[PDB]
Amino acid sequence: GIDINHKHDRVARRTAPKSENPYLRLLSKLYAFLARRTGEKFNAIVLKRLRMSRRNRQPLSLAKLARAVQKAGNENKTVVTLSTVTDDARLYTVPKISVAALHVTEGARARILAAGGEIITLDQLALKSPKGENTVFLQGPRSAREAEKHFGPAPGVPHSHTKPYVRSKGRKFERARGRRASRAYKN
Amino acid sequence: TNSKGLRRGTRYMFARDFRKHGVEHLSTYYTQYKRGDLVDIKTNGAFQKGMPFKAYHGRTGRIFNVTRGAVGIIVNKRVRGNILPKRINIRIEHIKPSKCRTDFLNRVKSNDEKRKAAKSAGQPVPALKRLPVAPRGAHTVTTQNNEPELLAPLRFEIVA
Amino acid sequence: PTKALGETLNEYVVVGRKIPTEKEPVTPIWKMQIFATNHVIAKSRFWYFVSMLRRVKKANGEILSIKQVFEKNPGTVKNYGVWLKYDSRTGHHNMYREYRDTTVAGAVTQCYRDMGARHRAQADRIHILKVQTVKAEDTKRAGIKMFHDAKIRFPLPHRVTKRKNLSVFTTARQNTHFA
Amino acid sequence: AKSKNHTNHNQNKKAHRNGITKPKKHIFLSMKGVDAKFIKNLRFSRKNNKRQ
RNA sequence: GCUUACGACCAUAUCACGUUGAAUGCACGCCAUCCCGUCCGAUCUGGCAAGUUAAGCAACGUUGAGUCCAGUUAGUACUUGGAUCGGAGACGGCCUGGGAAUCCUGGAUGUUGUAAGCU
RNA sequence: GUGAAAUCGCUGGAGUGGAACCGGAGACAGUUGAUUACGCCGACGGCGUUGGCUGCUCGUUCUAGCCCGACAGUGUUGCGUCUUGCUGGCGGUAGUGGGUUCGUGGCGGCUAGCGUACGUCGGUGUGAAAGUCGACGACGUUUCCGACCCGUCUUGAAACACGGAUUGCGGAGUGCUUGUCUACUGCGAGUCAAAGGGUGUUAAAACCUUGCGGCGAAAUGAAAGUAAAGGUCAGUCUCGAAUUGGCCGACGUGGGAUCUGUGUGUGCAGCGCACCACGGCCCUGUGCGUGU
RNA sequence: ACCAUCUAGUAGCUGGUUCCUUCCGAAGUUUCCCUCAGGAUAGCUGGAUCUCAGGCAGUUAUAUUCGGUAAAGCUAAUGAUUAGAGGAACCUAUUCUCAAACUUUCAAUGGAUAUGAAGUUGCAGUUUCUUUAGUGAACUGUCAACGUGAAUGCGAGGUCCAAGUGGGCCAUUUUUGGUAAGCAGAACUGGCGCUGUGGGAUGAACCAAACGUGGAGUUAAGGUGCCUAACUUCUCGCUCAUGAGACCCCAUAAAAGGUGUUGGUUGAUAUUGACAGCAAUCAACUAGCCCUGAAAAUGGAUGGCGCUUAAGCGAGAGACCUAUACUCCGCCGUUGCGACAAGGUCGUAACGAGUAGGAAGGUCGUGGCGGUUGCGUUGAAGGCUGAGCGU
RNA sequence: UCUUAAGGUAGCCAAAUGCCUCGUCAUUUAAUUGUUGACGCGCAUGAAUGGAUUAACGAGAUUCCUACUGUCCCUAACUACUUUCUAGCGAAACCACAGCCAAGGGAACGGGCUUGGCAAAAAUAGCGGGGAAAGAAGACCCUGUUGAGCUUGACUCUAGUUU
RNA sequence: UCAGAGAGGACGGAAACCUCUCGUAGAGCAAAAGGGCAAAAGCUUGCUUGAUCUUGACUUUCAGUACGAGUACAGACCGCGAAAGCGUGGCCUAUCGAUCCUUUUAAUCCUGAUUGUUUCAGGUAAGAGGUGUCAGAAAAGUUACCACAGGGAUAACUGGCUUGUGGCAGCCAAGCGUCCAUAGCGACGUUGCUUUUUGAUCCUUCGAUGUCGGCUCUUCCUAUCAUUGCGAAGCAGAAUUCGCCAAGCGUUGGAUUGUUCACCCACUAAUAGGGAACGUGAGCUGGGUUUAGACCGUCGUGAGACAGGUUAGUUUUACCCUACUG
């Protein structure tokens, strides 16, 4: 007998994408090879984000892409993101962007190409910068989800701003007792 | 079950020391407290206002607020498997500066001064680590005027 | 608890002293004679007795020297007197016992075995106050005195002999008498 | 059928099962519960200090 | 070596009896129109300077009580952990480490800061 | 049609002392395999590894005894401050010399399991068949060890707790509506489109089709209602709860995978994703509170 | 009443709840509830993972602190309580014995905090707060310098979803009620429940030690006359019992006694010859073994047989026996890491208990559908049963 | 003397009503917690919630005398039909597996477990010690936010009736 | 400056009031207990309403929910003080209340949706009316005519632990015994034994272990009544007592009572005590207890209750295994 604890012996991890998409699996294969051989944490990050679940890859905004590219020194670097690149109607001027991504929406692609930009795939990025040179790694906001709005301390505890699960919205839906001092108390 | 009043079981905890009752000496109020300082909590029964709870008596905390005649303190409290940093507003009379932190500050001051002096004078960097007391070294003991005494166990004697 | 393990307990001389302090820069040196199985037990019992006798414990003291004492002449027989203090199930008593042996360590081992046999007393309940060599005419125990006779003679009356490396069964007759 | 039976037998073991969690180190940075007047003055001071 | 005002630690500073007290000072002290307060100029308040160290106060004295410190009590009492340890049990000792307190004995009897002054 | 299990009869073999069944390990009966080199098995050597038992020989630590000298004593022979013995420390140690302790010591002897730096060799197998050899030996028999009846409630079941005589077949977390999280897929500030219409004859399918509808894109208040752009720099001033103009435009600071530059696995500097911490502003409700 | 239907009425209650391996693995506790056979709630648990690559720890050291229990005290306060002494009560100084709801004093175990980069020094700005006052307080700055400041060990942190549990019981120590209880109620820790294994003849908890499947070696507790693997092994004592004794929990024994025997303590007498009768003795104690005290009902229990310079009691010595424990060797799988152009193979180190429960794998099995691959009156399904394969 | 609406009157009684109680006395017997007759401060008798009697009647409860007897001392014998054996016919209950004991420990009363005592086919007729034997999801007790019959000064209603 | 003590003073005393000394709190502070307090937190007295308006933070219980209570601030307006300062009720630890509804106060407020005015009604904010089972249903009994789901989580009978109580046996001797503690007893104390008493517990059994007594029949234990063999007496003998080895063998017939017990009559060697599921109901009986019928007394408004009394009230199955008998 040996006095050790086995509760945390096994670590849950994704050794390959849960997706059955053949192209996603091929990309995971390619970047597993690249990470293993080049030994670059950039390739490791790309592999991990390829194998991640779609929940962890929130959509990215063309406004964020433009902001990243406009910063001093980033004008010529290639922006790499495993998140879908969406179009931002609030963005009026779009600079020249060189982006490698899994998926780019129609409007964002049209605007990027019209502005003189370039869109490539992850394998093309592998051919361009096998070690990730001259890259700007970006992703969408992970905590910006309606589901995440409901996470945290329970709505009925002090100093809690968690969103409750309510059938509807109105004066008749969980707004009387425990929400205002005129009814018992307020938290 | 026990009653859950505020001062249950504090008969001796909140009492004054023998031949120590009466007027409170004024160095207690003259002492300077600043936010970030460490202070020990020892309730003074003679001041019923701003008293700490019995669970914080004899505990050390860190000041985060300084009011006219009181201070806000962050004290660690054990609750099941978590240690909560509770915030309590205690008056000055129940508070005493903690000496452990000031001793550590003095040690750090001395370390910095020694390092600076050695560097300026060109000496090698001296050792600035506390070390556990090492085993005793080799030495010699002389018996001159200290001849060994032969000891033996003593017989049992009926001590009525 | 303490046990007198090992045939023929060894004898050690142990010298120690309290660790000097500022108020007592020079400390007295104490010395004891201890019979124990090995020197670790010797030191332990030394500190036991020294803590009993003087205000000092192992933490505040040190062992200047631990040495083994060997019998000067194991080629001669002596009578040994042993003054000991021991505790029974009811009270505490002082005993004086006598033994005959070629070594003081052997005599002390005999004392431990004899106390175990006759009073069911274990080594942890016995303190050996003193061990000395007594002259023939200063002995006061009949068992030892009856052997101080130059004309001593006696046979071996009923000798039961154990066969060692043979079969259990035999046709030989067994003889217990040998004239 | 007495059924009060309070005890504290296995509670320390349960608490230590996952380790006793000490408080974080950023708790001393927040100014929650600090004097309103001091906070007001601090806000005014921070609003006006010239960056360069 | 001192006095006063304001203090810090709050008896090593307290309490009892007694001796001494230079100079400043403190104090007692004289008066009660006025301010002020009382049954009462006793207290409090006001105007003074004849007189006194008598008291307070300060220093000192006591095989003084108290207080404080140290030794002894004592490696004792008690106690962490160990034993297929002894004992019917109550309990007891051993191993491994911590480790007191009375009685009794001896010593000490305020230290000191700011400001002003005396010698 | 097929024709199971429980149960039962016959023939042959074998066991059979107050249960029987069962696990582990052999043996027997039985079943089955078998192309000089090679297969299936054994023996003796070598080597690797883990050992088990048992001796000598050097030294090391602490120590003598024998031997010599004086003194003190006496369990004392032979014939009395005698002698011979013997003992005790004390002082010597030349020579001789054993105990005790172990060594980052030296040299051997016997022998085990596992594997094969590998050798020396025997059994058997190359048409059947018989024999021989090898392996199993399973609900057969016999031995040695172990062995209480399952399911369930229970702190506790082999229980003198309940269900269970035996066998076959059937037999129990499902459908749907509504939520939430998670995984995957398509599109993405959009997405899905309903009823419906048009078409479709392998026509209940598939295909086409939406000013409008659901959810999302804006919150807040009971409601009337209102409804989310500031940072920095420089001005005028009735120096205030004022005003003006440019530049930038989604805020500041700290930590931040990665990226970039530069030194020597490591260091420094720069731009910083997500996220975290600490703040700042903006919308709405409300209290206080002014005016322009 | 009977018949049909509402009606498969509801049940916090009883019973059942059907394939295999792998990994992780509890609770009987808190709070609220007309709540006490039940729920919700927190705790304990599983899974998914994600962000990173030094700050943590059921352990110590240093420094500083908290406490009023053990001990101690009442010739110190309060409350009891005996006796006298010096000046019937009274005073003085004493004295015997005490306190869960007394205490001057006060441990051991114990609790907490701190032990550097989120730090130390300066310089140079902000404030409407604070001060008579740059006087402070705090903050700000791509400010300048300094560079990791006890031991040991070790990767750390975050979020979400959810199960079972919410009758416990036992033991060392402490402890309340009770005469006690295999009784009732608590504190710390460890266990059983959920757990097998060696030993205690037998046993949920005791001693040893925790578990893949095998082998060799060595052991723990326990043992070595036969049951029964290991000595009638070695040394010294004690014990005779007309059923002696014989090994933690443990399976009852006391007060009081013995001129049985063995050792010790003390006090005397005795060779100027001690006790008995016309050369040691006497007396009182003490503690080992043995004996009396010691009576229950089916026949019976050191486990049994038996054992008497033991095969009993006590102190010891060599050797030997024996675990699922330790070391090494092989194989299986899990975990971590890694190599290889692969939903795969391989290497490598450590690891492998499990009830309730949760996940994963299943070229485990069954019946359909859209497809695909084939077999069949030269014999499919079904049924009975030898050679093999797979944990 | 306190006190009530009235304070149990006539009667009757250790009663089918008296706890103490096997009340005390007498009667019955050798012997009586029994019977009967008396006594009555009656726990808690009592007058149409009827009191006290009462001839006749009673498959009503009780005590005694006589006659009679196998109820008994103390059992025995006989008869019919069973059981028994045979021919024919032929079920059921029950069944985890099974059936020798002592002690131990264990869920505190074992057929199984441990240590001992032991242990030899196959059967017929009896037997009622055990199988904590079988019959039945304890009709006793408790729990359940399960019922039902009945009652009322429980809560909420209602037919009917009066105004 | 208190409690109290000492010493003085007409009536005045142990106790009225006046005076001086001492007085570490030995008093008082609304209440229970415990803390705290001496130019005060106590007593006397002056003035006052901070027991006011407002929002956040925190402590306590704790899930780190709510209420209640409290703490330290911040803004307003005030009270006392010469001022520093103190003050959000009581020196501190208890003294209390959700939703819905009603009611009141507040804005020169919002809404009544065909346009407006005024009533009326409804809203936003803060209080009160109360849930004491106090995190908050609206609530009387009986069942013996009873029922259902369960419970050995829970009682009544046995068994198990304990032995207070019950029974039995010892040690020291103060006394009894004409004298004499021990012939035989033995107080005050004290040590044990037993489970034939009754209790305590709730471990087993509630999908049932047939629950009193008697009859019948075995066997076992003794703490010995008788008999055999003995020892000691307050043993000269019918007789009687104590003790030892001793359960081999006996320990009866009856009246009353359901009775176990109890009591009496008689004989007898003796009329000993107990166990075996308080032995023994597929062995009996059914007198009692213990369903349903019925009567009385007391209790209850009543249904009904009563270890109070009384009467009547179904006692099933072996053919299986073992044991035993042949």
Ligand SMILES: C[C@@H]1C[C@@H]([C@H](O)CC2CC(=O)NC(=O)C2)C(=O)[C@@H](C)C1
């Ligand atoms: C404040 C208090 C309570 C109030 C009223 O009855 C309370 C309600 C509570 C509820 O939710 N539903 C009801 O039917 C009653 C009332 O009239 C008085 C007793 C006073």
